[PDB]
Each structure stands twice: as C-alpha cells, then as structure tokens.
Amino acid sequence: DIRVRRLFCRTQWYLRIDKRGKVKGTQEMRNSYNIMEIRTVAVGIVAIKGVESEYYLAMNKEGKLYAKQTPNEECLFLERLEENHYNTYISKKHAEKNWFVGLKKNGSCKRGPRTHYGQKAILFLPLPVSS
C-alpha cells in the first residue's frame, strides 16, 4: 500500500517536489527530491508524497498543481492502470471533469483543465527506488 517509486513521465521527466514544495520535472534521476511515496488511501485513491520534502502533491480549484505537507482532499488522486502498463492520475476533487496530473514537454506542470486523455504528458511509469 506504500510504494516508493519515481514516476517517470512520457515527456521524458521525473516528477520532483522541492523543499519550498515546488512541483516540477527533472532529467536528474539521482535528484533525491524525485523519490516519492505513493500511498494507497483507499481502493483507487492515492496520495503522492516526497520522501525528502515531506510535502504532498495536490491540485487546486483551477487545475494548478502544488504540494502541501498537511493533506486535504486536493492531495488525493484517482490512480489508474492502463492496458499499456503506464499509470494515470485524476484529481479526486475534480474527477469526472477529468483533470489529470501531467508534466509538459518543457517539464512544466500541466494545468488540470489543459490535460486530456491520450496526452503523453499525463502518462507515468512508476520506477522502483531501490537497487
């Protein structure tokens, strides 16, 4: 239920959250702020937490992505497995209006409203943080 992976994005970026709690991608594998804890809070729901910044991952009322430290329902995400074996994450608060978590080609966080299914920006491959 608690998995520490990296979350590699199809757009060639790992999701990383700063100490200032700034959400953003990186081509720096060995970045330590890109090691995340995907905690299953319920069937289908997940929380995404930085194992270094101790911050979460959330999305506001206008699709903007951020990271708290003290959870709320904006820190919860509908986690999905695809037929291809990548994963998708829809905001729980704004599900059914379909705002996916995404990282642009430039590494920027996609806005919940700008995201759409079939985008490469919203596709993640959670890699293990072990050895």
Q: How was this structure determined?
A: X-ray
Structure tokens at 110: 């996609």
Burial state string for 79-109 with b = 16 or more CB within 10 A and e = fewer than 16? beeeeeebbbbbbbbbeeebbbbbbbeebbb
Amino acid at 70: T
Structure tokens at 76: 């919860």
Q: Which of 26, 18, 35 is nearest to 106 (CA)?
A: 26
> If phi over 0 gives left and psi between -120 and 50 gives alpha, with beta otherwise, what is residue 26?
beta
Phi, psi of 111 (to 5 degrees): -85, 140
Number of domains comprising the chain:
1
Amino acid at 34: N
Burial state string for 49-59 with b = 16 or more CB within 10 A and e = fewer than 16? bbebbebbbbb
Residue 39's CATH number: 2.80.10.50
CA geometry: angle at 94 spanning 92 and 100, to 5°? 80
What is the DSSP track for 24-66?
EEES-TT-SSS-EEEEEEETTEEEEEETTT----EE-TTS-EE
Measured in angstroms, the resolution is 2.3
The parent domain of residue 36 ranges over 1-131
